[PDB]
């Protein structure tokens, strides 16, 4: 799992040398940054049920296909729509994890590590999630600087999808 503190560790450990001043400034940058990221963390957990059910409906509006045709892949049945809030409910968790971690670490392992191999099997088209996140990109309602950094991890998961 990646973290700008643990990047200062593993780069110092493979060299076999101590923690010089050139790794402490790496940790130092994150501390200033973390306070800012936590304001984006409180902005998302307060809007948990608002963003999920807003973005889940935002998929069905642009894609009326997945609500109609029968199949285990789509969400014509309620168990598809129940698993709809499973995925996008799990997407906003790791985005809130990646902001509090300060890095792309938990977003790397938990979400995008094997994501290109599941979607080839279960017929989950990645254009579904990539525009689910675009609704979260526009409707999180954050402002200031934390609106940019919460926007950073969203379109990092987009480039992993596409």
């Amino acid at each position: 799992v990646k973290t700008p503190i643990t990047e200062a560790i593993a780069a110092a450990d493979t060299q076999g040398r101590f923690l010089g001043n050139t790794e402490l400034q790496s940790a130092r940058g994150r501390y200033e940054r973390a306070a800012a990221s936590l304001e984006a963390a409180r902005g998302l957990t307060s809007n948990a049920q608002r963003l999920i059910d807003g973005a889940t409906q935002a998929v069905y509006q642009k894609f009326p296909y997945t609500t109609q045709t029968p199949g285990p892949q789509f969400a014509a049945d309620s168990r598809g729509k129940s698993k709809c809030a499973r995925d996008v409910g799990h997407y906003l968790r790791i985005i809130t994890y990646s902001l509090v971690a300060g890095g792309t670490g938990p977003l790397d392992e938990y979400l995008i590590a094997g994501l290109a191999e599941i979607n080839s099997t279960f017929d989950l088209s990645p254009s579904w999630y990539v525009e689910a996140l675009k609704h979260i990109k526009a409707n999180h309602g954050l402002s200031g600087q934390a609106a940019n950094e919460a926007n950073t991890y969203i379109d990092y998961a987009i480039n992993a999808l596409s």
Partner: protein
């Protein structure tokens, strides 16, 4: 790696005498049955990904703790590892179907396989639930006759049901 041809050799080598004409006539089934072996593996590997993804909805049908949060098949890397191991049995099964004797499956698939589930934490006995939930789809795809000339394919289907039964019993 062994065979039905080379286990007969090694059975005769440990005796150390020439093969009898009684022995070779029983082996002459296999050159006749090699017509029947060679397409039942071709039937499985043609529909290999259909068996895996349909039986991925069967272990996950009955035991919904696996995509429960905190489950062992829970996260995306873990679930991609489930599919990584859902067909790692099928190649080792279809190797034993072509070879005809399970000494390939027993030193590459099941040799110490049970040991890792006591090491990692993943439930061993749950894999044995879903593996014989493949064989009802594996036999059911290999048995039905559409197009192909009618034949007694029943005889080695009991072999195919035996190899899944061996591999499921030596996991859980």
């Amino acid at each position: 790696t062994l065979d039905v041809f080379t286990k007969v050799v090694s059975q005769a080598d440990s005796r150390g005498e020439f093969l009898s004409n009684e022995q070779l006539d029983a082996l002459a089934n296999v050159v006749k049955e090699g017509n029947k072996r060679l397409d039942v593996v071709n039937r499985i590997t043609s529909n290999a990904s259909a068996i895996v993804t349909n039986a991925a909805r069967a272990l996950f049908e009955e035991q919904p703790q696996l995509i429960a949060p905190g489950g062992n098949a829970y996260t995306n890397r873990r679930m991609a590892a489930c599919l990584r191991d859902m067909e790692i049995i099928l190649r080792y099964v279809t190797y034993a179907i072509l070879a005809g004797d399970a000494s390939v499956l027993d030193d590459r698939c099941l040799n110490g396989l049970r040991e890792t589930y006591q090491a990692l934490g993943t439930p061993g006995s749950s894999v044995a639930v879903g593996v014989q939930k493949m064989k009802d789809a594996a036999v059911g795809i290999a048995n039905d006759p559409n197009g192909i000339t009618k034949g007694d394919c029943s005889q080695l289907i009991s072999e195919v049901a035996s190899y899944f039964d061996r591999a499921a019993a030596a996991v859980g």
